[PDB]
Design a protein around this motif. Structure first.
Motif, PDB file in Angstrom:
ATOM      1  N   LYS A  53      19.322  41.102   0.646  1.00 28.69           N
ATOM      2  CA  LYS A  53      19.601  41.346  -0.764  1.00 28.69           C
ATOM      3  C   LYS A  53      18.294  41.349  -1.549  1.00 28.69           C
ATOM      4  O   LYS A  53      17.985  42.303  -2.263  1.00 28.69           O
ATOM      5  N   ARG A  54      17.523  40.277  -1.398  1.00 29.02           N
ATOM      6  CA  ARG A  54      16.247  40.139  -2.090  1.00 29.02           C
ATOM      7  C   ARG A  54      15.295  41.301  -1.799  1.00 29.02           C
ATOM      8  O   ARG A  54      14.564  41.750  -2.687  1.00 29.02           O
ATOM      9  N   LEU A  55      15.299  41.784  -0.558  1.00 29.06           N
ATOM     10  CA  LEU A  55      14.435  42.895  -0.159  1.00 29.06           C
ATOM     11  C   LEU A  55      14.971  44.240  -0.638  1.00 29.06           C
ATOM     12  O   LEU A  55      14.384  45.288  -0.358  1.00 29.06           O
ATOM     13  N   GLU A  56      16.088  44.207  -1.358  1.00 36.11           N
ATOM     14  CA  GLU A  56      16.712  45.422  -1.877  1.00 36.11           C
ATOM     15  C   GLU A  56      17.184  46.358  -0.768  1.00 36.11           C
ATOM     16  O   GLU A  56      17.099  47.581  -0.892  1.00 36.11           O
ATOM     17  N   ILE A  57      17.671  45.774   0.321  1.00 36.80           N
ATOM     18  CA  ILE A  57      18.184  46.542   1.447  1.00 36.80           C
ATOM     19  C   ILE A  57      19.696  46.321   1.535  1.00 36.80           C
ATOM     20  O   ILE A  57      20.157  45.187   1.713  1.00 36.80           O
ATOM     21  N   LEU A  94      12.790  43.315   7.427  1.00 39.28           N
ATOM     22  CA  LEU A  94      13.527  42.058   7.469  1.00 39.28           C
ATOM     23  C   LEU A  94      12.828  41.095   8.424  1.00 39.28           C
ATOM     24  O   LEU A  94      12.608  39.929   8.102  1.00 39.28           O
ATOM     25  N   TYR A  95      12.472  41.594   9.601  1.00 42.18           N
ATOM     26  CA  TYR A  95      11.809  40.773  10.597  1.00 42.18           C
ATOM     27  C   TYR A  95      10.501  40.202  10.057  1.00 42.18           C
ATOM     28  O   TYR A  95      10.222  39.016  10.220  1.00 42.18           O
ATOM     29  N   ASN A  96       9.703  41.041   9.405  1.00 43.55           N
ATOM     30  CA  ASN A  96       8.436  40.580   8.852  1.00 43.55           C
ATOM     31  C   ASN A  96       8.671  39.495   7.806  1.00 43.55           C
ATOM     32  O   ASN A  96       7.941  38.508   7.747  1.00 43.55           O
ATOM     33  N   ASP A  97       9.710  39.672   6.997  1.00 40.81           N
ATOM     34  CA  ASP A  97      10.034  38.712   5.948  1.00 40.81           C
ATOM     35  C   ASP A  97      10.511  37.364   6.488  1.00 40.81           C
ATOM     36  O   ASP A  97      10.360  36.337   5.830  1.00 40.81           O
ATOM     37  N   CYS A  98      11.082  37.369   7.687  1.00 44.71           N
ATOM     38  CA  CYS A  98      11.579  36.145   8.311  1.00 44.71           C
ATOM     39  C   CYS A  98      10.524  35.397   9.107  1.00 44.71           C
ATOM     40  O   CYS A  98      10.651  34.193   9.346  1.00 44.71           O
ATOM     41  N   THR A  99       9.481  36.105   9.520  1.00 45.46           N
ATOM     42  CA  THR A  99       8.458  35.497  10.357  1.00 45.46           C
ATOM     43  C   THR A  99       7.038  35.427   9.821  1.00 45.46           C
ATOM     44  O   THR A  99       6.292  34.510  10.166  1.00 45.46           O
ATOM     45  N   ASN A 100       6.657  36.394   8.996  1.00 45.83           N
ATOM     46  CA  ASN A 100       5.303  36.439   8.468  1.00 45.83           C
ATOM     47  C   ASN A 100       5.280  36.950   7.030  1.00 45.83           C
ATOM     48  O   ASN A 100       4.570  37.904   6.706  1.00 45.83           O
ATOM     49  N   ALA A 101       6.063  36.305   6.169  1.00 44.81           N
ATOM     50  CA  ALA A 101       6.155  36.704   4.769  1.00 44.81           C
ATOM     51  C   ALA A 101       4.898  36.387   3.964  1.00 44.81           C
ATOM     52  O   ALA A 101       4.212  35.391   4.286  1.00 44.81           O
TER      53      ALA A 101
END
Length: 101
Positions: A53-57, A94-101
């Motif tokens: 949601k936050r990532l606008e996806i 999404l993956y980048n945001d969960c691991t290396n934000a």
């Protein structure tokens, strides 16, 4: 039937995942990708939805036929009646945001 209901396995970070091409975009099974790469890194599909949601996806909603195929392929568990799809690019975001934000 329509081409959007035709499944195919595609590569995602070295693994094979189920996909459907909807509205001209190749989308992959979100829960499946989650189990393969974020099972522990985040723990919880609920959190995934929050981040998305936050990532606008906004994930594509699987229709009845797609859900049944994914269950048959083992992409999602037997008791699952709902499933969402997102592009590989969006999954990486999404993956980048969960691991290396």
């Amino acid at each position: 039937g329509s081409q959007n209901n035709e499944c195919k396995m595609v590569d995602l970070r070295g693994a094979k995942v189920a996909s459907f091409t909807v509205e001209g975009c190749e989308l992959i099974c979100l829960p499946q990708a989650f189990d393969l790469f974020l099972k522990h890194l985040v723990g919880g599909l609920h959190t995934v939805y929050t981040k998305l949601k936050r990532l606008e996806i906004t994930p594509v909603v699987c229709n009845v036929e797609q859900v049944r195929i994914l269950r048959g392929l083992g992409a999602i568990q037997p008791g699952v009646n709902r499933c969402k799809l997102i592009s590989r690019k969006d999954f990486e975001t999404l993956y980048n945001d969960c691991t290396n934000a």
